[PDB]
């Protein structure tokens, strides 16, 4: 599950972990086995223009179940009407740009994660890697094991 | 009826650097103070109150400053969308009343 | 965005009084739920205060009947007027909109310090 974080916010992504980025967008369970790394892609995706493409999620209805997708276009609310026919009050919209540029220190440079996460039910696992290919000795009385 | 003074009028600055606006009283406002960003076409919006502290979320590239009679709100690397108007609103006697300024547009390029 | 922060921290000798007051951005507060919580430096966390959408509040024990929380909702802001603050209220203070059930707290402040003289 790869995506793109604020420098700052990376602290976020831990088991049960509570704030923002981990509670209304991408929220990973207490229990979960797996690892994330993440790059300060300080370079990779930036542009003096504002590398802002990704807009974050700061206004969700209700805290999140692990690994929810919440893509969505709405308006977060107070009142009756959205702003459709309202203006000022209750006119929320829940993706804000991320605005990264150069100038931005360190804490804002935009940091690529990627989160791997193994299930193991039912596992009929297709998916090692120990083939030891050691080099075949010859000649002498030696313990070999060929392919079991 | 204390009477404050914003300064400069107007501010057109290159992209990428900093942005320093100072608004100046004409008495003791102490740390009681509160900046508004009305971007053209909705309500203002408050961005940062009192002598210094960062407003929740904003983005740090905000910075208010001052005390006493002479404050200052500072920004660290406008943004595009940053375009708008500020006002320095103080409350040192709250119960209801509120004393507003001039406002000052801000620019890029 | 949708926020809160706070103001009025700083230092006042003990038993004097000080009020501190959390305006928001974005999202509304006459109708919604507000809590005032704080934490002494270093220490853990105490709900100090709440008030509804209708103005039945709420205070913790430790500041019962010495603290009122009020709002102007016109202007879209909160207020909590504090009185004889004695040796314990030496807390950091944080305002957050809390729905409960439906969400858990969310949205809190940098924080303000208010201590005493000593």
């Known amino acids: 599950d790869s995506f793109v974080i604020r420098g700052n916010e990376v602290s976020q992504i831990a088991p049960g972990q509570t704030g923002n980025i981990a509670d209304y967008n991408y929220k990973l369970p207490d229990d979960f086995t797996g690892c994330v790394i993440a790059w300060n892609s300080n370079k990779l995706d930036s542009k003096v223009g504002g590398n802002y493409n990704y807009r974050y999620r700061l206004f969700r209805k209700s805290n999140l179940k692990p690994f929810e997708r919440d893509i969505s276009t709405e308006i977060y609310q107070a009142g009756n009407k959205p702003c459709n026919g309202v203006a000022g009050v209750n006119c929320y919209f829940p993706l804000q740009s991320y605005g990264f540029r150069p100038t931005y220190g360190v804490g804002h440079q935009p940091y690529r994660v990627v989160v791997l996460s193994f299930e193991l039910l039912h596992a009929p696992a297709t998916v090692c890697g120990p083939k030891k290919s050691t080099n075949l000795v010859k000649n002498k009385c030696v313990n070999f094991n060929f392919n079991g | 009826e204390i009477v404050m003074t914003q300064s400069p009028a107007t501010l057109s600055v290159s992209p990428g650097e900093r942005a320093t606006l100072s608004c100046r009283a004409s008495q003791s406002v102490s740390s009681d103070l509160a900046w508004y960003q009305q971007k053209p076409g909705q309500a203002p919006r408050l961005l940062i109150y009192g002598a210094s502290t960062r407003a929740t979320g904003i983005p740090a590239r905000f910075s208010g400053s001052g005390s006493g009679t002479e404050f200052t709100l500072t920004i660290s690397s406008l943004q595009s969308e940053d375009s708008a108007v500020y006002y320095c609103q103080q409350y040192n006697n709250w119960p209801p009343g509120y004393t507003f300024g001039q406002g000052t547009k801000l620019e890029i390029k | 965005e949708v926020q809160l922060v706070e103001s009025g921290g700083g230092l006042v000798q003990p038993g004097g009084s000080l009020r501190l007051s959390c305006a928001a951005s974005?999202?509304?507060?006459?109708?919604?739920?507000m809590s005032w919580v704080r934490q002494a430096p270093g220490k853990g966390l105490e709900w100090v205060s709440v008030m509804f959408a209708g103005g039945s509040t709420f205070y913790a024990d430790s500041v019962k009947g010495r603290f009122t929380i009020s709002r102007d909702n016109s202007k879209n802001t909160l207020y909590l007027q504090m009185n004889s603050l004695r040796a314990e209220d030496t807390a950091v203070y944080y305002c957050?909109?809390?729905?409960?059930?439906?969400?858990?707290?969310?949205?809190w402040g940098q924080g303000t310090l208010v201590t005493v003289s000593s």
């Open positions: 957050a909109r809390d729905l409960g059930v439906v969400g858990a707290t969310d949205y």
């Open positions: 974005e999202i509304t507060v006459s109708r919604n739920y």
